[PDB]
Design a protein around this ligand. Structure first.
Ligand SMILES: [Cl-]
Ligand SMILES: [Cl-]
Ligand code: NA
Ligand code: NA
Lengths: 435, 437
């Protein structure tokens, strides 16, 4: 039972060489909890993994199976990507984002992580006279910083907490007006906070990207997952909001991993502004041997990175997008379950002494979705994560996300089974009773 | 069908339309586009020998395992950070049973084909000694995409054509570069794309010894694994085994693709089998850009994870099952792909009966194996002139001009896709070409 012995916890941390639990890597945190579950015979409420909790859509799976039987495993995918995937991604951009993006400029990638890597690789080499590459609108996804670091590309970042709405203009522009940046990246909906960039904010970002001639990489990993609206019906409003409505300098990264529960197949698509795709950048020639942005990215960089994405997986994604386009599959009907879980879980935290840290978009309360953030009496997250583990819960801090809200933890709603909800509530009660 | 030779005006028009100035230097896309536009414009089918891609079906063991795993749920689960355990374990067993080398599962890293394996090997290996001016020394002729990878990474490289430096002559030639102290790595394919030459034991000992002496990492591209059909490397756990530099140095990365030996190119799956000692070796110069000190951790936990967060889960299962079946003696990979050698023997004879000579013709004193590729020349004619002659006679192949070869008379012939039903067409066309002379 709870709380778990303090000595046992120290011992298991020492075994893993963990000095500050708030900075432990995800694999070390997972190993710690797994070791504690075994040592104590308890099952933790594990809320730390931002991964799919739903099965892959049958349309995807069955298409891969059919295509493997037809012979695609022995055939290299086309240099520019599977034509069907490029075409359905183009249709998807129109039917779900209302953006006109040609199939030519829709590029299959090995997940949005390869999509981000190549975007940084090319976008941050567009202007050799600029000292920096990406401006990060954090809290964000730390692997993206590692990508830039691996590329040797300097970057800057700021925590969006104090700069929402019209306040975003002066803050973004403080960096862009140095003339030293090439790109901007953010996720919407956001990992880790679940904030959704408003149309006011997207207009500010787009206007400034055009003014300062920088490229916006918009990470739509949690596609259409702001459940306060319904973005799931093709060809009619509402549509997923996008910076593409406010600038021509954009790359829209679409992953299959979250909205299509397809993380294992490593397949995504970059939907690149058509005008950007054709734009001639002399500074790309030395390293890529292409002048046009899109050719440098797709024909040179991606080809060199992996010579395409898994052929069966390209078909799986094409089939899933087509089904959405055609009105035969509603992607939101399954993933909205995460929001239903969030509504329940948020209330358990708030009933037991917690507050939502990143709590609003404009005046709208935070959506119920895949993640939310919590704090407990402003205590440092390094202390709160220890308190979680003592009470058989696991979640991550925001310490490596660029957030300056040192009290914040990220709660994920995906894997925790509803059958463990009674245990989560009891544990939160016990945690709050200790105080 | 219309008849040969094709009219020179027609060929000029279609080339001009594609903006091809020197056909011997045209990219593979433009060459392919030219031939398809000529086929369509003339009602003929060319004998297309230019594409170095599998011509056999993917093995059922791979396909069926992917199918089962997709049904079981792998599509919704990110692959483990270090790779699918089963693939790591089966690759380790494969190194032991087919190369006779002990490489732990920990150091066997799944990649999105060998092209991702090569990219990440350059990315990391060429950052191991910041005080060295160059990255890779290419033992060419080779795979031009590798040079583009170094170019993209901003890493200088050097290259030489192995033709004049075989056997003991390789030592002085390789050492002329390495003794400058400015290189980090060496790469070659064995069997080789484009020449089908296979590095001899004598040459592998030289490369390994020099790699140890000058502290450089050898990247051995085993894309055509076990495909020297002059020997039989297909029986697990008994000699002969696939020759490898791993017998002669601890500084090695073995790149194993599924694309050719397992006709699995579409699924973008391979494995780097990294020397265990190398995997654990600490390199201070990797920390700044990778945030790891050990070579293996910089490559797998940092670099590959940033590159794509793994390889397709079902594909990792497919390759694991194929390696396992080889390891367990249930599948023989050579029994399928030896078909390429059967075709090579026939095709070589057609070229040689019609005035050609084999350019890269021997490994030591042994005639070149019958396999996936071979090189031909025609009266020492420049390959930009010979490729024009091929096209006029309804044949397509590539020159060696973008491979690092200085044998400017050579063309690469691939035996993979050309259907046997077209063998008589190839023969007729070679007769006609030779008669013109
Ligand atoms: Cl970082
Ligand atoms: Cl190049
Ligand atoms: Na809609
Ligand atoms: Na053997």
């Amino acid at each position: 039972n709870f709380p778990i012995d303090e000595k046992l916890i120290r011992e298991k941390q020492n075994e893993l060489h963990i000095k500050d639990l708030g900075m432990a890597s995800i694999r070390d945190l997972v190993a710690l909890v797994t070791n504690l579950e075994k040592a104590t015979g308890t099952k933790f409420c594990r809320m730390e993994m931002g991964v799919p909790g739903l099965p892959a859509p049958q349309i995807g799976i069955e298409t891969e199976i059919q295509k493997l039987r037809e012979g695609v495993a022995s055939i290299y995918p086309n240099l520019d990507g599977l034509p069907e995937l490029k075409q359905e991604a183009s249709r998807f951009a129109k039917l779900f984002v209302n953006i006109d993006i040609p199939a030519r400029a829709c590029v299959p990638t090995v997940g949005s992580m390869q999509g981000c890597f190549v975007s940084f690789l090319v976008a941050n080499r567009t202007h050799k006279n600029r000292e920096y590459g990406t401006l990060f609108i954090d809290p964000g996804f730390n692997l993206n910083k590692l990508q830039c670091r691996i590329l040797g590309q300097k970057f800057e970042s700021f925590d969006l907490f104090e700069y929402r709405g019209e306040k975003l203009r002066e803050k973004l522009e403080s960096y862009l007006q140095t003339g030293q940046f090439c790109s901007i990246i953010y996720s919407n909906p956001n990992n880790p906070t679940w904030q959704c960039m408003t149309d006011e904010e997207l207009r500010i970002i787009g206007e400034l990207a055009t003014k300062h001639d920088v490229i916006v990489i918009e990470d739509l990993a949690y596609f259409g997952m702001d459940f306060r609206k319904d973005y799931s019906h093709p060809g009619e409003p509402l549509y997923q909001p996008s910076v593409a409505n406010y600038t021509d300098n954009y790359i829209l990264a679409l992953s299959s991993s979250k909205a299509f529960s397809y993380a294992g197949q490593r397949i995504g698509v970059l939907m690149i502004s058509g005008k950007l795709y054709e734009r001639e950048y002399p500074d790309l020639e030395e390293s890529f041997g292409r002048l046009r942005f899109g050719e440098a990215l797709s024909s040179s960089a991606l080809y060199a990175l992996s010579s395409g994405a898994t052929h069966s997986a390209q078909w799986g994604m094409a089939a899933m997008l087509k089904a959405c386009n055609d009105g035969e599959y509603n992607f939101r009907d399954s993933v909205i379950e995460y929001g239903r879980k969030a509504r329940i879980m948020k209330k358990m935290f708030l009933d037991n002494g917690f507050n939502i840290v990143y709590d609003k978009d404009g005046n709208e309360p935070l959506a119920d979705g895949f993640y939310f953030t919590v704090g407990y009496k402003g205590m440092d997250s390094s202390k709160l994560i220890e308190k979680f583990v003592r009470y058989g819960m696991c979640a991550i801090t925001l310490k490596t996300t660029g957030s300056k809200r040192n009290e914040a933890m990220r709660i994920c709603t995906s894997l925790l089974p509803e059958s463990q909800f009674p245990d989560l509530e009891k544990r939160l009660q016990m945690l709050n009773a200790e105080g």
